[PDB]
Design a protein around this ligand. Sequence first.
Ligand code: ATP
Lengths: 58, 50, 506
Amino acid sequence: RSVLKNTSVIDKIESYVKQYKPVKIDASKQLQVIESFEKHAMTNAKETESLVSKELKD
Amino acid sequence: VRYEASLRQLEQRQLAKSVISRVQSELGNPKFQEKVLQQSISEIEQLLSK
Amino acid sequence: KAQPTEVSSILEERIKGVSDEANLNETGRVLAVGDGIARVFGLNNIQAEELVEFSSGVKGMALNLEPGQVGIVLFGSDRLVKEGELVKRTGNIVDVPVGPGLLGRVVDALGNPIDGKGPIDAAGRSRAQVKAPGILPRRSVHEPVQTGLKAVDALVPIGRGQRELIIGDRQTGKTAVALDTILNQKRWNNGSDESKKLYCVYVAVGQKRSTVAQLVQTLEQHDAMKYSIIVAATASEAAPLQYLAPFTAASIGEWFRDNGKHALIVYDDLSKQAVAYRQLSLLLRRPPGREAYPGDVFYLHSRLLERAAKLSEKEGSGSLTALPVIETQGGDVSAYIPTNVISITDGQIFLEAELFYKGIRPAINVGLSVSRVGSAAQVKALKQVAGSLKLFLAQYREVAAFAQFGSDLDASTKQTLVRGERLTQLLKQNQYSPLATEEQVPLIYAGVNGHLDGIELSRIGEFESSFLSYLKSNHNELLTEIREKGELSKELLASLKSATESFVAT
Ligand SMILES: Nc1ncnc2c1ncn2[C@@H]1O[C@H](COP(=O)(O)OP(=O)(O)OP(=O)(O)O)[C@@H](O)[C@H]1O
C-alpha cells in the first residue's frame, strides 16, 4: 500500500476484501443421504461377508 | 502501481520538453555577456588555488 | 513530480562542484577519426586502457599508445565524435558499478541503466580487466546447480564454479536452457540461506532489442527480477560495447564471488562476441588468422571464462559459474570458434538441431553432451539412481543405427529398445516448468527399473504429470525425505519402489 503514493483506492478495496472476509461457507449438508448410502452398502456387505463365511465352511 | 510508474514517466517527459523550453528561455539572454564574468572569476578561483 | 528535479539539482551541485576542480591533465585534440576509431594528439599522461570522454558524451577506451599519439576505441556510433573536438580523460581503467543494488536493473556495458528505474544504487566500481584467481585459492567443485531440467541434471550435471558450455545451432532451443535454469533458481531465491541462493546475471550480447525486452518481461512474469542482472549489448549498438559487455558482467559476477554469495552468469552468446572482436581487430589492421578471427581470439574467451570458479574457504567460499552459448553453423563442432570455447569450458551440452526437428525439446544429444567435473558435484540422490542412465543411453545409442535395418532381433535388444524409447520420450519438458531434484529422482527412478514398459508411448507425457500429482497428493513425505536428506537409503528406496508399483499398476 505504501508503494502507491496517490493511494485513493487501496483502503477502498482493502475494505472490500474485509467486507467479503466472511467469504462463503462449504457444505457438509449430507447427514441424511450419505447415511442412507452407507446403510445400503453395509447391509449388502454384512450379507455377503456372512454368506461367504458360511459357504467356505460348507 | 504500473499506472503510477507510467504517470511518473509522463511527468518526466513533460519536464523534458520544459527543459527544451528553458534552453530557449536561457539562450536569448545577455547572460551570454554576463556569464563571461562568471567564468572570469571562476578561473581566478581555480588557477589561484594551486 | 519535482523530486527527480531535486535529485538532478543535487547532481548539478556535483557537476558544479566538479567544475570547480576540473583541471584535466590530459585534454587533447582529435586528429583523425576513421574506421570507427579515433587518433588523439596530446594526453601525455594517460594509461593503457584508460577511460576517456569526448565532447559529445560518447565515452572511449584508450587501447593503444604510440610515441606521438594515442589510439582510442569508441563506445558507440562514431556519428557523435567529430574531428577537432576536446578529449578530457576521466582517470580510470574501465570500470563498472558492482554491488547488490543492480538486482532488478537492466544496464548496458558501462553501468548506464536503461530500464527507466532511476540511477544504480552502486556499491562500488570494479575493473573490467581483472586478473583471474590463481591456482591456489581454488577448490574443485562440490555443490550442485540444480537446473531443473530433467536431462541436464540426469546426464550432465553442473557444479558451482564449473564452466559449462551450451553449444547448439540457430533457433534450436539454446536460450531456453539458460532461461529455465534462471527460473529454477526461484526455489532458493525465495528462501533464507545465502549459501543456497544463486543469483543470475544474464548477459545478452548481439541480440535484438525486442528479444531482450521479451526476456525481461518473462523474468518479471515468473518473478526472477528480484535476483536478475541483465547486461544488454544489443546489435544496434556498436562493436566495442559488445567487446566489453561480457567482461563488465564478469566483474559483476566477481563481486558476488568475493563476498561469499553464490552466483550464476550466462553469456549469450559469445559467437557474437567474437564477431565484435573480429570487427575490432579488422579495423585496426591487425591481420586475421584461421577463418578471419584474429589470432588472439582464443585469449579473449580465455580471459573471459577464467574469471569463474569456486573459491575455497580461504577467500570466503564464494563462487561464479558461467554458461557461455555458442552459435555454430549447421551442427558443426569444428570451426575455429567452437573449438576454442570447448577447449576452455568443462564440457558441452550439444543441442543438436535434428532432435529438435523431431520436437524433443530440449534436444540434448546424450552421446555427445558430457561434463568433466560435473559428476563430483551432482545431488547424491540422482547419482544413486542414475548411475546406469548414461551407460544405458550409450547402450541405446549403440543400437540406434542397427535397428534401422528393420530386421527381427533377439529379446534383449527389443527390451532395451522399448526402455530407450520410453526414456527418450521421458526426458521431454515444456517451457518454464523446471522440476526440482526432489521430483527429478522419482521420474528417472520409474524410468530406470522397467516400470514404464507396459505403457504405450503416447501416454508418457501425461504420465509425467499424473505420477507427479500422485506423489504430491499422497506420498508427500517421500518428497520431503528427498528434499531434506538428498539421498536414498534402503528404506527410502523400498518405499519409493512401493509408491511406483502402486501407480504403475494402474
Ligand atoms: N521446452 C520448450 N517448450 C516450448 N518451446 C520451446 C522449448 N524449448 C525451446 N522452445 C522453442 O525454441 C524456440 C527458440 O528458443 P531459443 O531462443 O532457446 O532458441 P535459440 O537458438 O536460443 O534462439 P536464439 O539463438 O535466437 O536465441 C522458441 O520459439 C521456443 O518456442
